[PDB]
């Protein structure tokens, strides 16, 4: 069937997903984008409506795999999207309640514990890093929204592609001792080059937010605490950066390369 | 003391203009914000026409100014001229300095970037801090691409300031690493070697174009290797400037004593 009218009951419903508070209530989140509604489908997440604009291929009508297929007009499109340029395919899809309790760690895992909230887009930007590297599990701050169509687009969909789970730190710091997992502390003024640390066993990075950078509570709880070297004016990195490249650095050592 | 107290002052609309590239061009000057940024814009020989002041600048912010003219800024004509939320205490007005690629000298093993087309701002910013940290030893970028915007300034920390980055031509860049005799090392999606198997020891310029479209094909038939980053989920693709990271990183890690994968 089709929605016309922007004022429809069922379109002012799918506009209010916007809202964290409104996707809390109903259980539901929107994925907005062609490339976005592909991942959080390959993720296994629950569709429930696809939401067809103008201008979808055909193809976009067999994603459903016979959930309702809502095709909406331009202007209904125009509310329900936030975007500046309306993507033509959307789905709702249900909000998953996970528990880090649930979580088990296959062998030699790569952990990142993200402390702290930071800047806009960096952790869309930090989960695109371990989603490419492969990394087994993220840590983020208790506050953070994961089913934002901020986090949905910056990430690309990576945020479906893994285990993501924001956590108080007092949780973080429970699990990982429970794990008995080494913990490598990222710090401009660590002991040790990141490229020094053994990351063939498995591994949590520790990595903080620009604004306070890691509390000292946490410099202390690690094994090893380890820098990015600066050779120039600048004194550091964006933090995303840094987690990108710590990551990449233990793939190369799982990939046969040796700590230097 | 030379105050600016309405955002309607003219002074401060022209100011705020300083943000779009074209009035850059027609002025020859451009804004730098923030006191770090300006110490480094002055500490690269950058020539300052005048200083900003907000109403909380330190009072040896006014020791920045040399033969400057310094105009003291209200809470609300600060909040105009800034590129910011919150906006820097500290501002300079510089001349648009004048970049010669044929004083560039390089020695031997040097570590270059060769950013080929164009992508965001914020893109560019974050290359530069990441070659600055590296140690990079040049960076060439396409041949309009704005090194001065008020995004590179403050994504590249002021590092765009005494970083060795050169607006040039495609024809110009590839003149001038054949002129160097410097292999390339391509750095793209297909490439049948992980990055981690070049050998970076002994000097190398990475190709790098924009995520969007790719790599020209008249530039990956000048590339000696052609390498990829791994990605190992569904997404074949990162940021560029998360790609330029990776690699500069991965020659400083072979530069510092580590071997080729």
Same mark, same amino acid.
């Given at each position: ?50 939401? #067809? !604009?103008?201008?979808? +291929?055909?193809? @976009?009508? %067999?994603? $459903?795999?016979?959930?309702? /297929?809502? *095709? ?50 960096? #952790? !869309?930007?930090?989960? +695109?890093?371990? @989603?490419? %590297?492969? $990394?087994?599990?993220?840590? /983020?701050? *208790? ?60 591994? %949590? ?56």
């Amino acid at each position: 069937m089709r929605i016309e009218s922007p004022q429809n009951p069922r379109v002012k419903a799918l506009a209010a997903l916007k809202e964290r508070k409104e996707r809390e209530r109903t259980g539901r989140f929107l994925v907005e984008g062609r490339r976005e509604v592909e991942r959080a489908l390959e993720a296994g997440l629950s569709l429930e409506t696809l939401l #067809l !604009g103008p201008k979808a +291929r055909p193809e @976009d009508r %067999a994603l $459903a795999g016979g959930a309702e /297929v809502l *095709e909406l007009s331009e202007r209904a499109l125009a509310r329900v999207s936030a975007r500046e340029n309306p993507a033509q395919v959307l789905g709702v899809f249900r909000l998953p309640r996970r528990s880090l309790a649930g979580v088990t760690l296959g062998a030699a895992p790569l952990v990142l514990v993200l402390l702290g909230l930071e800047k806009p887009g960096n #952790l !869309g930007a930090i989960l +695109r890093a371990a @989603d490419g %590297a492969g $990394a087994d599990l993220v840590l /983020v701050a *208790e506050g953070v929204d994961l089913f934002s169509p901020q986090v949905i687009r910056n990430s690309t969909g990576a945020v479906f592609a893994l285990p993501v789970y924001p956590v108080a730190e007092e949780e973080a710091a429970r699990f990982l001792e429970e794990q008995n997992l080494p913990l490598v502390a990222a710090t401009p003024e660590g002991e040790r080059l990141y490229w020094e640390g053994d990351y063939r066993g498995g591994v %949590a990075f520790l990595l903080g937010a620009e604004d306070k950078g890691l509390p000292e509570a946490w410099k202390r709880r690690a094994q090893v605490r380890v820098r990015i070297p600066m050779r120039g004016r600048a004194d550091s990195l964006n933090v995303a950066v840094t987690a990108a490249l710590l990551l990449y650095e233990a793939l190369r050592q799982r990939s046969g390369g040796a700590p230097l």
